[PDB]
Design an enzyme around this catalytic site. Structure first.
Site, PDB file in Angstrom:
ATOM      1  N   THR A   1      46.333  73.826  25.598  1.00 31.89           N
ATOM      2  CA  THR A   1      47.037  74.334  26.770  1.00 31.89           C
ATOM      3  C   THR A   1      46.456  73.447  27.905  1.00 31.89           C
ATOM      4  O   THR A   1      45.111  72.987  28.068  1.00 31.89           O
ATOM      5  CB  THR A   1      47.107  75.606  27.236  1.00 31.89           C
ATOM      6  OG1 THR A   1      47.617  76.619  26.423  1.00 31.89           O
ATOM      7  CG2 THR A   1      47.631  75.891  28.516  1.00 31.89           C
TER       8      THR A   1
ATOM      9  N   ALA B   1      49.030  84.410  25.158  1.00 36.50           N
ATOM     10  CA  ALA B   1      50.231  84.293  25.389  1.00 36.50           C
ATOM     11  C   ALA B   1      51.101  85.382  25.950  1.00 36.50           C
ATOM     12  O   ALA B   1      51.849  85.423  26.849  1.00 36.50           O
ATOM     13  CB  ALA B   1      51.045  83.548  24.304  1.00 36.50           C
TER      14      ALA B   1
END
Ligand SMILES: *[C@@](C)(CO)[C@](*)(O)[C@H](Cc1ccccc1)NC(=O)[C@H](Cc1ccc(OC)cc1)NC(=O)[C@H](C)NC(=O)CN1CCOCC1
Ligand SMILES: *[C@@](C)(CO)[C@](*)(O)[C@H](Cc1ccccc1)NC(=O)[C@H](Cc1ccc(OC)cc1)NC(=O)[C@H](C)NC(=O)CN1CCOCC1
Ligand SMILES: *[C@@](C)(CO)[C@](*)(O)[C@H](Cc1ccccc1)NC(=O)[C@H](Cc1ccc(OC)cc1)NC(=O)[C@H](C)NC(=O)CN1CCOCC1
Ligand SMILES: [Mg+2]
Ligand SMILES: [Mg+2]
Ligand SMILES: [Mg+2]
Ligand SMILES: [Mg+2]
Lengths: 233, 195, 212, 222, 222, 196, 204, 195, 196
Positions: C1, C49
């Site tokens: 990420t 997430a």
């Protein structure tokens, strides 16, 4: 969190054209010690279901009491307890399956592998498995422990898929089961010669056979086997 | 040890190496030169486990200097880097491996080209336009990806390098006490004193 | 990420990558790492997430209940603190969260709050969070000014994600841009890194190491 | 020490068309190196034109599907028989999964159906509740084998227009139900060849505005 | 792996499946597990693939040199002794589980060896992950005084049991028949009951689909 | 395993079951645990199959080489060679061996060698996992200077119980008779011994 | 700290009609950090091609080792080594380091100069030979490559068609793997000509 | 978090606290104020576990402000420090303890004296002329032992404090990005902007 | 421990050794392992002394309260209460209990409760560490409908062997006879039983 103490080995079963067969030996092992020899591991519920249990025997005996209590509870305020509103195999299984999964989810499982064999009210064959993890599955042949590894291969030669069930008679099916029990006695170190067998037929009903023995065994070839290689005498 | 960088430009290779030696909660020294001259046109910077670094650097230096005297000839940067890689490749399966990472900056006098080699302690060699070891790469690589051009001059390379050190001084947790910068070109090796 | 967000003259720029990995396996290239809390607030995904998703969706419900009761837009400070106080209750349990709560109100102006699963809550001008944060920081720091244009700011955020998408193995897929104003956020499109890389390489002259 | 989780193997696959959606899954159930069942379905019609599968640990998978099925039932009771839209089902499932964040359902969940514009819709979930709508998703044991193939054949990734110097991409277009089923069958036969936990049979559930249809195909039993 | 060995009237027969695995992935769909030690002494191997091959070749090499030195055809007990002493020396770290069989001037023989260096004797044996499925068949159908054609049938049936029921075994059946007074006949792919069905679609790409940056001729000549 | 060796009037008899296990799976149900190290010196093997096998082979090699130089070895000598291997390699071995042999001077003799590598000369010896269940029985029923038929019944009845209770034991009961007359192999099947 | 997935990378090989193809990505990294986009994993010794995935230091070391061994082979034999023979040499060499192995996944590819037969083979780190008619895969995206090859492949493809199939197999497999990609190379090998093509792929 | 210092002089208490906020290999912020005003003449600096620090500081701040409103009166520094200690003393035997260390600098208006309290996360309170938490003490304490006099002015205290920061900047491994300095005296709390 | 209970013609007899150990040290050489839960319902205790003691006390309390309301409990009922405690607290208990009692309707009965908490009704039962050595002996020598003197000899000879081989067992052999006649305590000293 548990560890099993007194344990029961393989439970094997299959479907045939008019019903289901299930079998399990009469041994209660205490580790390598073959402690108890009069242990019945097939438990009938009504005249249309047989629950076969392997694994921990203390937990098996608990499950016996639950099933026994289930029959009592069903009979309460139920005029059709011996007719339309009798206990079906599917009801008994779903109950046990619910319990097994709830107990695993509380990190305190009933250390068992269970096979519910029976015939439904409409004549359909019922055969389904459940274990300590709450895992469930159905198949023309079902077996626990060593039975899964050794019996299923033999039983699947008779009934390999759904379409083989109508083509299989009770005589052929029972013969395969009795053969599978012999093979397990040869190869499973925690098995006994004595066993019980149950047939649930849609016509002839529940036939419970006790004190069976493995027979017609091949041992004669052992006398020729000498040493482990280079030994002659 | 910690921060070692390297940039290959048009006509030279530039190596930047941090000056700090920390042992514990104390910065023992702030003027440490983490490099050795292997040959007149070949320079090797190093970072890793204490002791192992210098011991390895000097051991390589001795071997290259021995070769130079024997053949009266300077090994190419490619040849030196291959020798160094093999030594680290042996080392990794030893009883106690050298835990040393190196950058080899050199000028090939036969090709008239600067060359930069990055070799980790496992013996993983790669030729690069710009290189780094340790956490330094996580900041510098993307910065160089953006600002680096292959036809840059030495002065442009130093400005690009200043840009890297500034970013490291801004975002790195540890005080590495600035860098010693050295340039490798056709005329050999020289140190930039004011950085 | 890789996610970033920075304050500037024209408000806030938020930029994120789109990749999601489970070990070396690339699970998704089309993930949405910007949450639309309400038409005036944005939040970014880094770390867990479901957590980011679940709790910043929940945050939007708390912000809606605030402005129903108080008849007034919730401040960025108050919104960010609702989230940070929540995750602090769960501290130790194993929540994984690194987020920038971004917004633009009358009393505060453009505001960014870094909120953390450790319970950290930091107000700031520039933030970068994720595996490829360091790569994004390098581009941001060397090019950032308060007097950037909305056009140049959007590009800087896009270019900084590209930088990280390239080098960081756990970042990439595509770039999602947002521009936060006082009248609300404005989406500035999904940009595939595969196409963007070559486009940027040619027009900018950068990435000369790479052959195209 | 007692380990509450297990791996029942198998693999699943969801693809979305223009006016339809398919959710496929093999019928094999395993533990370790043994086959439990050659035909044990794990793709279910849950009502309101929503098909669902929760592949991984079957006990958790069955529990989840059972709970969601029940969720649909109570949605009807509490909201005047209103149809549960695929997007609303997805959000509801997130809360089911995240409800056990610190003792998770060990399953990769996929649902399929039609969105409120009548267009095909596939949603996919991680074990703890994160979800995302997609055209394409493979889940389970052979997901890593099947998924890159779908990227190539459904979304036309890495495919450029011939003679355009790799400058013009192959244009995205919806696939017919006939073309989709071909890709499903080839995906599973390929997965069956190289993954030991995949085989026996393939069951596909197709979802159109007319309802839920089924198709079954044999797979290799070794 | 699944491997078996069966004795009959005038010799011995061994058989094996043809699957090789790394984890749950099928690495090789048609590998050869039957190994030649000498012309009329063959070996079936289960366990660590490289080890069963390396150890069978080394002993095979030394058996050939021994056969040349003594001017005699090699014996099964010599291969058995050399294998077990080698495997014992390495305390199980060479993970070779072997079924050794063959004919020699002494007669026909059948043995099994385990990784730690223990040997067994028998009329019917089975090793590997599918040995329980195979042994179930062998225990059901084996009898004294089998013919050649009966032993091949029994052996391949025992391998099939492993192929279908064991996930660590699959694909084809290899057989080797070693009869006294005859050449040993190696029957590679004796049965092939797992042929891949026709694919639904051809995935042949239009030429130019792949984008290319550079081209160059590679020099392989001097 | 269940194994034993019993001295009697005419010599000594060795006895053993035929079960080999890998966990709860029976790898071999017709194993021959009685092995020849010399013409009239035999041993019962318990513990690790690979270890006991390797040891027995080395002993057979030593006694063959002994015979080539110095003639027939004593049963004590054979036990000494077993001990030497078991004791010196105690850290790397799991072997419980009973050595039994027939001299003409010394008649029948039984030496037991447990895990440690110690030697113990006894009138009779029991060993292996299944022996635990028959200590009581064997002690009450053993007598010195029994006949061949009595000693065969003693071993048969003893091992039958050991087999009955021990899951790690089973199959056929093999026996080997060592007397001046020669070497005689005996076998006894489940259908006989189970119903004793 | 799993040697086989520190650096990352992939190799794939295929057979066609009178031809073979071998392809590899260009990435070399240190876990998450991408370090080099020029690291080729395919080498050749005469007409025999060898691809190697795994720990990069061992990839380099083995290339150097097989160049060493094939050069001595040629000097003594007075001919180039063939693919079948070279495959055996690789297996021997790897098994020699049985209890201290090179952490690699090699792949041999080439056409036998005498018989003209296309040949491919794969190995595990310890030397086990995996021969195949159709395709061999190796690397951190081996699962992905297995899935691509098993569906995309068909027998007797022409060199120009085979190029498209192997290239699409590698590209789409690489894009689903974090540690693979950053460029790619494909070798098309005919009886007496070899073409090398660099593919355009996404650079993340 | 990391560096927090405190010096009590003749007529005031001076607190210095580092500005860096490091998260991993990244300095996320370089202007962080690690302090809260508990009351007009009482200031508390803090350092420790992330999140816990601010959460604890603000919780104390709320309680003291609540007391002030209820009684229309300012608690003495001694009273505040005793309250804070007890809260940390409870905390240490909780399920999850606050891992926060604090310095409380205050001016007692009734005594007309400055007061400095050092309290660790266990609830260990001590009144001191000069205090520090973490590794800072290992450098500063000996330096203050030498240079500190009890009758010093605020300006002399700041010079003494500059001497400490210089030593820390020289010998500390990590870059803590300077300090924010605040003075507590009879006229309340004020920040030195140029340090 | 070595403990056992044996049914016979006139009722049932319980038997036990007297050794309590803390490691290899004998903490008590004259222990009474046979304990009364009711007039003619007794139990043999094996495993943890503290656990089996706490259980027996709770059972004695339950059966005393049962008797106050519903009269004399069956032996099965007593075994059921033992099971209930042993099964439900299986994670925190180490108790191997044999329950034996005399009804007038049901005569002598023996229930064994191993570690798990399962119940097994048997003609006779053996338990404790020393029971492993007498499985063979007891199986060969037990007969149904024995006399009092025969059953006493059976227990005496059995426990004598269990004591002989088990280090964790020893001291005196206590016995408790349960018949219609009443309750009789018997004791047997080493000098007698050792030389059997
Ligand atoms: C069946 C398939 C077991 O699943 C057989 O035992 C088979 C035997 C065989 C295969 C080919 C040729 C001859 C014999 N075994 C395998 O295919 C084997 C399975 C296995 C994997 C790992 C093991 O770890 C101890 C043991 C057995 N597969 C392999 O050996 C593959 C080719 N190689 C690897 O997995 C690499 N391993 C080897 C062991 O050392 C670590 C790396
Ligand atoms: C009974 C069955 C159990 O003790 C006997 O002792 C029997 C003795 C025997 C067997 C065959 C031939 C002659 C004599 N022992 C076994 O069957 C033995 C059980 C055993 C294994 C390992 C031990 O410690 C090292 C102790 C007892 N079985 C085997 O050796 C089998 C063939 N192999 C394995 O179980 C594999 N082992 C190897 C050693 O490491 C653990 C895995
Ligand atoms: C024989 C001696 C050994 O099993 C019997 O089972 C005997 C039974 C007995 C003893 C006294 C009164 C009635 C019945 N058991 C013991 O003597 C017992 C040995 C034992 C201790 C702990 C066990 O697991 C928890 C299992 C067996 N001895 C004791 O309980 C002695 C008095 N105490 C200890 O050894 C102290 N233990 C307490 C439990 O934790 C370990 C330390
Ligand atoms: Mg990337
Ligand atoms: Mg199979
Ligand atoms: Mg206790
Ligand atoms: Mg004693």
């Amino acid at each position: 969190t548990q560890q099993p103490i007194v344990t029961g080995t393989s439970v094997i079963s299959m479907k045939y054209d008019n019903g289901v067969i299930i079998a399990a030996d009469n041994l209660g092992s205490y580790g390598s010690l073959l402690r108890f020899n009069g242990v019945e591991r097939l438990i009938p519920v009504g005249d249309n279901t047989v629950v076969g249990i392997s694994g921990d025997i203390s937990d098996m005996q608990h499950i016996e009491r639950l099933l026994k209590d289930l029959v009592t509870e069903n009979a309460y305020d139920n005029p059709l307890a011996d007719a339309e509103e009798a206990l079906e195999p599917s009801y008994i299984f779903e109950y046990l399956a619910t319990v097994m999964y709830q107990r695993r989810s509380k990190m305190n499982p009933l250390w068992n592998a269970i096979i519910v064999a029976g015939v439904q009210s409409n004549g359909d064959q019922f055969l389904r498995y459940v274990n300590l993890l709450g895992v469930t599955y159905s198949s023309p042949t079902l077996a626990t422990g060593f039975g899964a590894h050794m019996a299923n291969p033999l039983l699947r030669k008779v009934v390999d898929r759904e379409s083989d069930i109508p083509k299989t008679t009770v005589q052929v099916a029972e013969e395969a089961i009795v053969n599978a029990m012999r093979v397990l006695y040869y190869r499973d170190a925690r098995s006994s010669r004595n066993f019980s067998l149950a047939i649930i037929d849609k016509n002839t009903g529940l036939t419970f056979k006790k004190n069976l023995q493995v027979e017609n065994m091949k041992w004669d070839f052992a006398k020729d086997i000498k040493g482990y290689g280079t030994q002659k005498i | 040890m910690d921060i070692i960088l390297g940039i290959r430009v048009q006509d030279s290779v530039i190596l930047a190496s941090s000056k700090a030696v920390t042992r514990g909660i104390s910065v023992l020294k702030d003027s440490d030169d983490k490099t050795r001259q292997l040959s007149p046109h070949t320079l090797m910077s190093f970072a890793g486990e204490a002791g192992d670094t210098v011991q390895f650097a000097e051991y390589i230096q001795a071997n290259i200097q021995l070769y130079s005297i024997r053949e009266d000839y300077e090994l190419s940067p490619q040849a030196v880097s291959s020798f160094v890689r093999q030594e680290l490749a042996k080392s990794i399966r030893s009883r106690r491996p050298y835990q040393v990472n190196v950058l080899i900056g050199g000028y090939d006098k036969k090709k008239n080209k600067p060359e930069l080699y990055q070799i980790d302690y496992l013996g993983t060699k790669v030729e690069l336009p710009y290189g780094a070891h340790g956490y330094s790469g996580f900041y510098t690589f993307s910065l160089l990806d953006h600002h680096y051009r292959p036809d840059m001059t030495t002065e442009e390379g130093l400005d690009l390098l200043k840009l890297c050190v500034q970013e490291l001084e801004k975002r790195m947790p540890m005080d590495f006490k600035g860098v010693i910068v050295k340039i490798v070109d056709k005329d050999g090796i020289r140190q930039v004193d004011d950085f | 990420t890789t996610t970033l967000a920075f304050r500037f003259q024209g408000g806030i720029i938020v930029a994120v990558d789109s990749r999601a990995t489970a070990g070396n396996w690339v699970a998704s290239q089309t993930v949405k790492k910007v949450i639309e809390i309400n038409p005036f607030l944005l939040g970014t995904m880094a770390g867990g997430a479901a957590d980011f998703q679940f709790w910043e969706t929940w945050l939007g419900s708390q912000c809606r209940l605030h402005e129903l009761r108080e008849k007034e837009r919730i401040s960025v400070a108050a919104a960010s603190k609702i989230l940070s106080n929540l995750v602090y209750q769960y501290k130790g349990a194993g929540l994984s969260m690194g987020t920038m709560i971004c917004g633009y109100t009358r009393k505060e102006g453009p505001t960014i709050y870094y909120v953390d699963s450790d319970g950290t809550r930091l107000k700031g001008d520039i933030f970068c969070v994720g595996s490829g944060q360091t790569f994004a920081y390098g581009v941001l720091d060397s090019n950032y000014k308060w007097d950037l244009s909305v056009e140049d700011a959007l590009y800087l955020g896009k270019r900084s994600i590209l930088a990280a998408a390239h080098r960081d193995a756990y970042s990439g897929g595509s770039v999602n841009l947002y521009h936060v104003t006082e009248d609300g956020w404005i989406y500035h499109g999904n940009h595939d890194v595969g196409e963007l890389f070559w486009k940027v390489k040619e027009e900018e002259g950068s990435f000369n190491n790479v052959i195209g | 020490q007692f380990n509450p989780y297990g791996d029942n193997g198998g693999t699943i696959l969801g693809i979305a068309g223009e006016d339809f959606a398919v959710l496929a899954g093999d019928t094999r159930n395993i533990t370790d190196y043994s086959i439990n069942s050659r035909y044990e379905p794990k793709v279910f019609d849950c009502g309101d034109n929503i098909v669902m599968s929760a592949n991984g640990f079957a006990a958790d998978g069955d529990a989840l599907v059972k709970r969601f099925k029940n969720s649909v039932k109570w949605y009807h009771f509490d909201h005047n028989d209103k149809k549960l839209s695929i997007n609303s089902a997805a959000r509801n499932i997130q809360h089911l999964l995240y409800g056990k964040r610190f003792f998770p359902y060990y399953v990769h969940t996929i649902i399929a159906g039609l969105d409120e514009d009548g267009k095909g819709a596939v949603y996919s979930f991680d074990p703890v509740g994160s979800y995302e709508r997609e055209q394409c998703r493979a889940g389970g044991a052979a997901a890593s084998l099947i998924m890159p193939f779908l990227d190539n054949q459904v979304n036309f990734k890495n495919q450029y227009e011939p003679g355009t110097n790799g400058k013009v991409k192959k244009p995205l277009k919806y696939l017919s139900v006939e073309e989709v089923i071909k890709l499903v069958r080839d995906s599973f036969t390929s997965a069956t060849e190289r993954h030991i936990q995949v085989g026996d049979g393939l069951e596909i559930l197709i979802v159109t505005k007319d309802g839920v249809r089924k198709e079954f195909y044999e797979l290799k039993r070794d | 792996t699944t491997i078996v060995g069966v004795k009959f009237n005038n010799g011995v027969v061994i058989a094996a499946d043809t699957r090789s695995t790394q984890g749950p992935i099928v690495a090789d769909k048609n590998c050869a597990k039957l190994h030649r030690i000498s012309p009329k002494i063959w070996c079936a191997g289960a366990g660590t693939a490289a080890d069963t091959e390396a150890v069978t070749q080394l002993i095979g090499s030394n058996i050939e040199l021994h056969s040349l030195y003594t001017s005699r055809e090699p014996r099964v007990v010599s291969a058995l002794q050399m294998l077990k002493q080698h495997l014992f020396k390495y305390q199980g770290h060479i993970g070779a589980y072997l079924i050794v069989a063959g004919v020699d001037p002494t007669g026909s023989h059948l043995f099994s060896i385990h990784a730690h260096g223990s040997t067994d004797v028998g009329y019917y044996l089975s090793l590997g992950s599918g040995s329980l499925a195979a042994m179930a068949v062998l225990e059901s159908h084996w009898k004294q005084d089998l013919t050649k054609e009966e032993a091949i049938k029994l052996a391949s049936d025992a391998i099939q049991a492993g192929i279908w029921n064991d996930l660590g075994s699959g694909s084809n059946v290899d057989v080797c028949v070693m009869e006294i007074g005859k050449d040993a006949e190696y029957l590679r792919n004796y049965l092939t009951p797992n042929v891949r069905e026709e694919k639904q679609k051809s995935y042949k790409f239009p030429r130019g689909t792949t984008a290319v940056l550079k081209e160059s001729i590679v020099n392989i000549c001097d | 395993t269940s194994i034993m060796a019993v001295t009697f009037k005419d010599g000594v008899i060795l006895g053993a079951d035929s079960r080999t296990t890998t966990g709860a799976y029976i790898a071999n149900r017709v194993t021959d645990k009685l092995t020849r190290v010399h013409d009239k010196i035999w041993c019962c093997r318990s513990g690790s199959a690979a270890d006991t096998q390797a040891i027995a082979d080395i002993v057979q090699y030593h006694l063959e080489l002994y015979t080539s130089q110095y003639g027939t070895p004593s049963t004590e000598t054979a036990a000494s060679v077993f001990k030497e291997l078991c004791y010196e390699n105690k850290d790397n071995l799991t072997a419980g061996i009973i050595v039994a042999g027939y001299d003409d001077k010394n008649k029948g003799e039984v030496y037991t060698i447990p895990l440690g590598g110690s030697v113990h000369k006894l009138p009779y010896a029991i060993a292996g996992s299944g022996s635990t269940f028959i200590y009581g029985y064997c002690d009450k029923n053993f007598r010195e200077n029994m006949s061949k038929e009595e000693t065969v019944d003693f071993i048969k009845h003893s091992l039958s119980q050991a087999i009955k209770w021990d899951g790690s034991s089973g199959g056929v009961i093999r026996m080997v008779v060592l007397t001046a007359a020669g070497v005689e192999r005996l076998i006894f099947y489940p259908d006989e011994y189970e119903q004793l | 700290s799993d040697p086989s997935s520190i650096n990352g990378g992939i190799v794939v090989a295929m057979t066609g009609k009178d031809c073979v193809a071998i392809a590899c990505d260009l990435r070399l990294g240190s876990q998450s950090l991408g370090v080099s986009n020029k690291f080729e994993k395919i080498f050749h010794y005469g007409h025999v091609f060898l691809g190697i995935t795994g720990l990069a230091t061992d990839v380099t070391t083995l290339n150097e080792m097989f160049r060493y061994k094939t050069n001595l082979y040629k000097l003594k034999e007075e001919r180039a080594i063939e693919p079948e023979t070279f495959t055996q040499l690789v297996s021997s060499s790897l098994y020699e380091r049985r209890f201290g192995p090179y952490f690699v996944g090699p792949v041999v590819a080439g056409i036998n100069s005498k018989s003209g037969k296309p040949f491919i083979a794969g190995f595990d780190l310890i030397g086990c030979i995996d021969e195949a008619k159709d395709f061999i895969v190796s690397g951190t995206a081996s699962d992905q490559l297995f899935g691509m090859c098993e569906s995309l492949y068909e027998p007797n493809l022409e060199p120009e068609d085979l190029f498209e199939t192997i290239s699409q197999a590698l590209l789409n497999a690489a894009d689903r793997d974090a540690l693979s990609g950053w460029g790619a190379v494909v070798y098309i090998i005919k009886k007496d000509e070899v073409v090398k093509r660099y593919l355009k792929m996404r650079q993340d």
